Design a protein around this ligand. Structure first.
Ligand SMILES: *[C@H](O)[C@H](C[C@@H]1CC=NC1=O)NC(=O)[C@@H]1[C@@H]2[C@H](CN1C(=O)C(Oc1ccc(Cl)cc1)Oc1ccc(Cl)cc1)C2(C)C
Ligand SMILES: *[C@H](O)[C@H](C[C@@H]1CC=NC1=O)NC(=O)[C@@H]1[C@@H]2[C@H](CN1C(=O)C(Oc1ccc(Cl)cc1)Oc1ccc(Cl)cc1)C2(C)C
Lengths: 306, 306
């Protein structure tokens, strides 16, 4: 029993974190095989980052300009190249701690674990969702660039996020490991804003199913609703539309608890229309949307990773 | 910017987890140097755990009854002994991944990270507080016994918790690594209940300071209050008393933000008396109490561990 915002064990990623220094800038890099991946704005200076021309900035660079440190062991850069918004530093040693891995790009609505890092040293781990507006509500201070987000399936690390910047609402933006930004953001210090967000509807329903599995049932009801009449209510609470695919995803949870998906939407409808009225659900006084249907089955069933 | 319930990187602990099997029971053990620590109710059967006599049960045991598996490598038990509610299995190999460590017992109100484990394989990591009633609100399924809780300071792991049981309200109880229970609980399947809980007052104030550091200020006010007049209000919202020591702990946070501790108590007083009125604080609609003043400074300053 219980339900916690749970991250993957971070060990396999901790062994890949290194410190990358170029001149005055220091940030984190990800060392897999004989390549170190890091944000390309490491080549930038303070006066550069207002409107940089990275291709120009990089041809003026040499390998020996890049100080790569894996703990207290130096790393020798033997090549470099730009891939979109990331830099790939080829080094003379392959990381013997390289796990089985994949570079995957996730969808808004999906979750992942973030290993926050400073000076190549891991600071903490936590769970995040990719917001519908392609931002993440992280916890990042200066120096955290190059920290990565990831999921683990069995023994394989699927890297999905590298941190690049903080936006003025306190939210965070970054790239997949191929260097392509999530959302309409650029690694320049120009005026940028997140874009209006919505609540991840299928995730709320998953979390309501976790609550039922854990003995919270006060929000249940005898009512029902059609998928279209629910979506009419979702649109007005700035929830995003529920699809038949989302209904299908929620199948196992519906089967496990005996509550048809559409019945749970009737519950969400009333919760949106009435609030919670001093009650809580899974220790929260808000409708939580950063748990996927997968996350719920993971935690409410006890799957591990090896 | 941002504020997340953040766990320590779990790598150093992942390398210590092993699977301990005795007859029909399988649970997790903690392998440090040449000792494996695990819950003593691993020696128990189904019919045993209603009222066991562990000393009797253990003399009927031999080393070869204990199957210890470190991944897919067997471990040879060469001795065993009971220490309070934990079992210490001496094995023929020292764990070469043994980190620098300490066995520490924490206070109610303090936090720690939990590496949830099944069959010696880590499943996930999350942050917990020790409740005033000596329970923890964890996420634990059958097979999770022997999972440990811990803090990391620089390179040293201070183990503070080993999981033993779930109570009927869905909360969890366990021991320090010397085998002594937190709270009035016993590793027997007799009727037991958690005992009435309170809210950790100093932690709420710390979290209010984190909110201010992160730009939430709507709950601030010009009022003030004496420590005694606050404690009179705390007692009636079932918050526990605030001490001058707690005021002292909150000093740096008060200095960083310019809000005297007693002024922040006046804010908490009004929040208790009025609620939040549709607003949120750090993405929560409830007053959060599982962040210590240390946790806040950690996250709002960016300290790492190596
Ligand atoms: C990398 O270590 C660092 C991590 C940031 C710093 C604090 N939290 C984080 O996640 N990233 C950066 O510094 C990037 C880097 C240049 C600018 N930048 C930003 O995150 C951010 O810079 C500011 C942050 C806060 C303030 Cl008050 C002012 C600037 O960039 C933007 C700020 C504001 C807008 Cl409207 C757009 C971008 C880059 C992007 C090369
Ligand atoms: C160890 O793997 C396991 C972990 C538990 C199981 C589910 N979540 C957990 O944290 N621990 C135990 O099984 C211990 C073990 C014997 C009993 N026990 C309990 O956690 C618990 O057992 C029950 C759980 C749920 C129900 Cl519906 C019924 C029993 O023990 C108690 C239950 C109820 C009371 Cl009032 C008191 C104890 C022990 C304690 C030797």
């Amino acid at each position: 029993s219980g339900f916690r915002k749970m991250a993957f064990p971070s060990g396999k990623v901790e062994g890949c974190m290194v410190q990358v220094t170029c001149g005055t800038t220091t940030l984190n890099g990800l060392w897999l095989d004989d390549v170190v991946y890091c944000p390309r704005h490491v080549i930038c200076t303070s006066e550069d980052m207002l409107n940089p021309n990275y291709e120009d900035l990089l041809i003026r660079k040499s390998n020996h300009n890049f100080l790569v440190q894996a703990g207290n062991v130096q790393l020798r850069v033997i090549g470099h190249s730009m891939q979109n918004c990331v830099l790939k530093l080829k080094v003379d040693t392959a990381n013997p701690k390289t796990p089985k891995y994949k570079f995957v790009r996730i969808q808004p609505g999906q979750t992942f674990s973030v290993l926050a890092c400073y000076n190549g040293s891991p600071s903490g781990v936590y769970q995040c969702a990719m917001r519908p507006n392609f931002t993440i509500k992280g916890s990042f201070l200066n120096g955290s660039c190059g920290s990565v987000g990831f999921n683990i399936d069995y023994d394989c690390v699927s890297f999905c996020y590298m941190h690049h910047m903080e936006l003025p609402t306190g939210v965070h933006a970054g790239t997949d490991l191929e260097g392509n930004f999530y959302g309409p953001f650029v690694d320049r210090q120009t005026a940028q804003a997140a874009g209006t967000d919505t609540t991840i509807t299928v995730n709320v329903l998953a979390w309501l199913y976790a609550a039922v599995i854990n003995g919270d049932r006060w929000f249940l009801n005898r009512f029902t609703t059609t998928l279209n009449d629910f979506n009419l209510v979702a649109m007005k609470y700035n929830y995003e539309p529920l699809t038949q695919d989302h209904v299908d995803i929620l199948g196992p949870l519906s089967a496990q608890t005996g509550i048809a998906v559409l019945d749970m939407c009737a519950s969400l409808k009333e919760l949106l229309q009435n609030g919670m009225n001093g009650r809580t659900i899974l220790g929260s006084a808000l409708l939580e949307d950063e748990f996927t249907p997968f996350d719920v089955v993971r935690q409410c069933s006890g799957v591990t990773f090896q």
